[PDB]
Swiss-Prot record:
Disulphide bond pairs: C23-C70
Domain of life: Eukaryota
A GO term for molecular function: collagen receptor activity
Sites carrying sugar chains: N18, N109
Keywords from the UniProt entry: Cell membrane, Disulfide bond, Glycoprotein, Immunoglobulin domain, Membrane, Receptor, Repeat, Secreted, Signal, Transmembrane, Transmembrane helix
Entry similarity comment: Belongs to the leukocyte receptor complex/polymeric immunoglobulin receptor (PIR/LRC) family.
Function noted in UniProt: Regulator of osteoclastogenesis which plays an important bone-specific function in osteoclast differentiation.
GO terms, biological process: immune response-regulating signaling pathway; osteoclast differentiation
Protein known as: Osteoclast-associated immunoglobulin-like receptor
GO cellular component, one term: extracellular region
Protein's gene: OSCAR
């Protein structure tokens, strides 16, 4: 039975902060291991006698990012037997979130989509010549759709997105989309 692996405070963070990775097995275990892609031995492990093991990652750098899985092990199990792995948990430690893309949608009212590669983000649309955000939208899906009404449609637009709470991790600005 696979354990579960979760991150606090978040799964996307700025370098410097502290992260706790928590692996919960569905039954009591002896050893918990955190595994990265391409390495067969666990990167880190804890011998606890619990369903739960916690790995404190201090002042994180991009070395602490990447794909994580957790596996656990009971001592009465055969040599080299671990449990099924948890679903992956990928930790993104970065000062700049990947650039989103602003594209025109099919369709009077024009529709734009600002698409990034992360879920649960806040998206902000700008029109060149205007200093304050033209529009803004929080989305669960990794995109936001903004609508432009008639004679307002023409212009040069760009968007970006950021984490929905402080401290903020900001993406770079999309390339411009001319309408």
């Amino acid at each position: 039975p696979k354990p579960w692996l979760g991150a606090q405070p978040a799964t996307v963070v700025t370098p410097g902060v502290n992260v706790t990775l928590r692996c919960r097995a569905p039954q009591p275990a002896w050893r918990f291991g955190l595994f990265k892609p391409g390495e067969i031995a666990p990167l880190l492990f804890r011998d606890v006698s619990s369903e739960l093991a916690e790995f404190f990652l201090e002042e994180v750098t991009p070395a602490q990012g990447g794909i994580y899985r957790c596996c656990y092990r009971r001592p009465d199990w055969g040599p080299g037997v671990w449990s099924q792995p948890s679903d992956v948990l990928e930790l993104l430690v970065t000062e700049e979130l990947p650039r989103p893309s602003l594209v025109a949608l099919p369709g009077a009212n024009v529709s734009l989509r600002c698409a990034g590669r992360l879920r649960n983000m806040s998206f902000v649309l700008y029109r060149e010549g205007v200093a304050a955000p033209l529009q803004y939208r929080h989305s669960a899906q990794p995109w936001a759709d903004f609508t432009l009404l008639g004679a307002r449609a023409p212009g040069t637009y760009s968007c970006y997105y950021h984490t929905p709470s402080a401290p903020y991790v900001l993406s770079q600005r999309s390339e411009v989309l001319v309408i």
